[PDB]
Amino acid sequence: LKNIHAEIRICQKFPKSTVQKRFSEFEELIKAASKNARNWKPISSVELFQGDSSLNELFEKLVIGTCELRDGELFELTINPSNIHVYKLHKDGPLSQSQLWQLPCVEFDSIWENLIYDSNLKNEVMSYVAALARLSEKHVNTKIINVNRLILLTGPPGTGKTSLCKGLAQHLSIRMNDKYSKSVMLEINSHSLFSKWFSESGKLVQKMFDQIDELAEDEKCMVFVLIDEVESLGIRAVNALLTQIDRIRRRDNVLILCTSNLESTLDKALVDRADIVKNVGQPSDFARYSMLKSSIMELARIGVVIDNEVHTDYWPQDICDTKAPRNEFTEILFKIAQEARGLSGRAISMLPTLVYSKSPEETITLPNCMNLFLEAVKERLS
Amino acid sequence: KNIHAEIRICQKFPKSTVQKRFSEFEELIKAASKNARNWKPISSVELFQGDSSLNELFEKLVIGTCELRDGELFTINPSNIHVYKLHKDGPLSQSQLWQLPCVEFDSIWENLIYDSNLKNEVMSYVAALARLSEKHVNTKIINVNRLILLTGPPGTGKTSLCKGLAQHLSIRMNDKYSKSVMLEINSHSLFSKWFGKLVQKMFDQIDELAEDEKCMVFVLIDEVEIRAVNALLTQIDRIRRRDNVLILCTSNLESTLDKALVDRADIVKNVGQPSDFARYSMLKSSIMELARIGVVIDNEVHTDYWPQDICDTKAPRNEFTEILFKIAQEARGLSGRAISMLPTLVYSKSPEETITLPNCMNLFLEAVKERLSR
Ligand SMILES: Nc1ncnc2c1ncn2[C@@H]1O[C@H](COP(=O)(O)OP(=O)(O)O)[C@@H](O)[C@H]1O
């Protein structure tokens, strides 16, 4: 496939100066890792029969991803060394000032891979926003070609729009790391803390955006602006906000992301200002299963769910495309997903800890796990 | 299927010698299990038979299981059986910091009485959050906020439940956590009135304590009900991210202030109907308020014989407290809101504008029966 990217996280103790010098060894790693890899699914180690274990001394985690393939697809390759980016995440943490995030940070790193959708939504947003960023970096005339530098995600509260914005900025900061030396993200109104004072109205919306502006005045640095619960905000201040929004988007090295927890009453002013408006719905039956399966598999990783009676093949597998014979356990779990139609994405993430409390035993058997999960679902719906 | 055991040991005896006699403890707990109450303490004195040497070591033992009801009267793991040693004097103010398990919190869990099996549900759920956290479950796959909000009227002993919960967790997670510490903020509603800069400071000290991975950190914020609030919520997040911490919150409002915290909470549990002991607390609080005002004045009866706090459910009770508890039983149906409005009706019945303690009891009792009817 023509354009595929690779993100590689090195150690802090690994000197960045030597990276370009040992760049050849990284490319060998990527060739070996691609022999068995899933799209956008991170590999943390090169195991036996997959290549020299000395390749493990190079990286902490690598991701190989493309927008040409489905979100989970396995590869079957030609990767230009310009699309492979090496990075180290900052652990500095969020700062009070409206929270400032240093990108890429430790907190955002595992978001993207764990976001589950059935509509190829992740690929669509990723590729489109990358195009907006790529164009903007190349200083496109806004008059000739219309680039708003704003993106809007809408849907119910449980769909994880914020997580999309976090993870999206995480990837873009790495993707564009050759173009930008430093990358920051400013998050506003998380959650609805800003809105009440904003409803009361104040002058400091200007003051807040003026600081973003200074950070935007800094070139070779891209800034991300996330705005949560937009309609909780949007009244003298909403004009200042929109005016301040307009000032910010004019910069080439800036990108603003909005999320609206309300559906079907979108503010006309924001839709008009958006490059793209994406609706994120509550997960479908296939997506619900995927989340439930991921929860169980994670519960098994930490040793919460252990069962030696049933083997890996018999364990619930990926149910994608109905291309494999659905195991009864795979089927029973799917039946649970059918019972969990009302539950949101966040609610499904909440389910495991409720299941854990119900279980008497310190460790849950797989057959009982299915039974407990079903009970929690029913209890959560009531 | 799931049973734990906790054992308090005298400050004298070392921790190794107890480990040597550990096997004897297992055989002892099984024997003590035969005749026992769930989640109720068994004293060393209770059984003189067996070893005086083994009984010299421990002060009391508590056997608890979440599958059984609270007081029911009816299978051992060395890990499931824990061994704790009380911190004699750990309350220091700055907000307060507690070293767990402490002596003060040690007897409160057994004195909490709910009609709704509330203790077991909360115990089980918070334990699940504690275990999941300790195993470092990925947040992005399985969402664990490690923040818990408990809501109910001022008489239902919410903050005590949090204290007793953190006490038992430090003992249950004894093997995983070497040290356990709890910070209690805003008890009660004191920090907002104070004018801050201190909230950033005290939370920074928690961060320092929470830096130790072996340490277990509890943060209890009670009476939760613009710049100071944001700063408080931000600090909550930085702690919330840590794997070794747990945030316990109590609110007097059932549902008025939801947006900020409810979303952050793993679970929001309501206490439910007030128990007999809860309604007693609300009735006593009203009478003392009427006394402070000057509505209820009695110079014949001394302060010792006035209604007192029932800290121990089986301790001796004064004649007046025994009466007020009876009246609290009389009002089984009334909600917390109804009981808090009774004093107005009580004062209405009194012709004297000034009320003695015996007449205060009679008028409260009448007011209770009239509001039940109507
Ligand atoms: N599609 C999904 N896949 C995996 N987890 C999800 C999904 N949707 C929601 N979640 C979980 O629910 C939470 C919702 O996060 P957030 O982005 O704040 O939701 P929203 O932006 O819709 O309010 C996330 O932390 C995530 O763990």
Author numbering:
A (entry chain B): 8 to 83, 88 to 108, 122 to 258, 274 to 421
B (entry chain C): 9 to 82, 89 to 108, 122 to 222, 226 to 255, 274 to 422
Article sentences:
Here, we show that Pch2/TRIP13 comprises a new family of AAA+ ATPase protein remodelers, with a substrate-recognition domain similar to the NSF/p97/PEX1 remodeler family and a physical mechanism closely related to the bacterial ClpX unfoldase. Pch2/TRIP13 proteins are members of the functionally diverse AAA+ ATPase family. These proteins share a common architecture, with a family-specific N-terminal domain (NTD) responsible for localization or substrate recognition, and one or two AAA+ ATPase modules that typically assemble into a hexameric ring. We show that TRIP13 converts closed, active MAD2 to its inactive open conformer, and that p31(comet) functions as an adapter to recognize closed MAD2 and deliver it to TRIP13. Thus, TRIP13 regulates the SAC through MAD2 conformational conversion and safety belt disengagement, and a similar mechanism for HORMAD complex disassembly likely underlies the enzyme's regulatory functions in meiosis.
We attempted crystallization both in the presence and absence of nucleotides, and successfully determined the crystal structure of PCH-2 without added nucleotide to a resolution of 2.3 Å. While the PCH-2 NTD (residues 1–99 of 424) lacks detectable sequence homology to other proteins, the structure of this domain shows a clear relationship to the N-terminal substrate recognition domains of a AAA+ ‘classic remodeler’ sub-family that includes NSF, p97, and PEX1. In PCH-2, the NTD contains a single folded domain similar to the NSF/p97/PEX1 N-C subdomain, and as such does not share these proteins' substrate-binding hydrophobic cleft. As in other AAA+ ATPases, the PCH-2 hexamer assembles through interactions between each subunit's large AAA domain and the small AAA domain of a neighboring subunit, with the ATP-binding sites situated near the subunit interfaces. Although no nucleotides were added during purification or crystallization of PCH-2, we observed that two subunits in the hexamer (chains B and E) are bound to ADP, enabling a close analysis of PCH-2 active site structure. Pch2/TRIP13 proteins, in contrast, possesses only a single arginine finger (R312 in C. elegans PCH-2), and our PCH-2 structure shows that a conserved arginine (R385) is properly positioned to act as a Sensor-2 motif. Within the hexamer, four PCH-2 subunits adopt a ‘closed’ conformation equivalent to that observed in most AAA+ ‘classic remodeler’ structures, with the large and small AAA domains tightly associated around the ATP-binding site. Asymmetry in the PCH-2 hexamer arises from large conformational differences in the remaining two subunits (chains C and F, also bound to SO4−), situated on opposite ends of the extended hexamer. Instead, the PCH-2 structure closely resembles several prior structures of the ClpX unfoldase, which contain four ‘closed’ and two ‘open’ subunits arranged in the same pattern as in PCH-2.
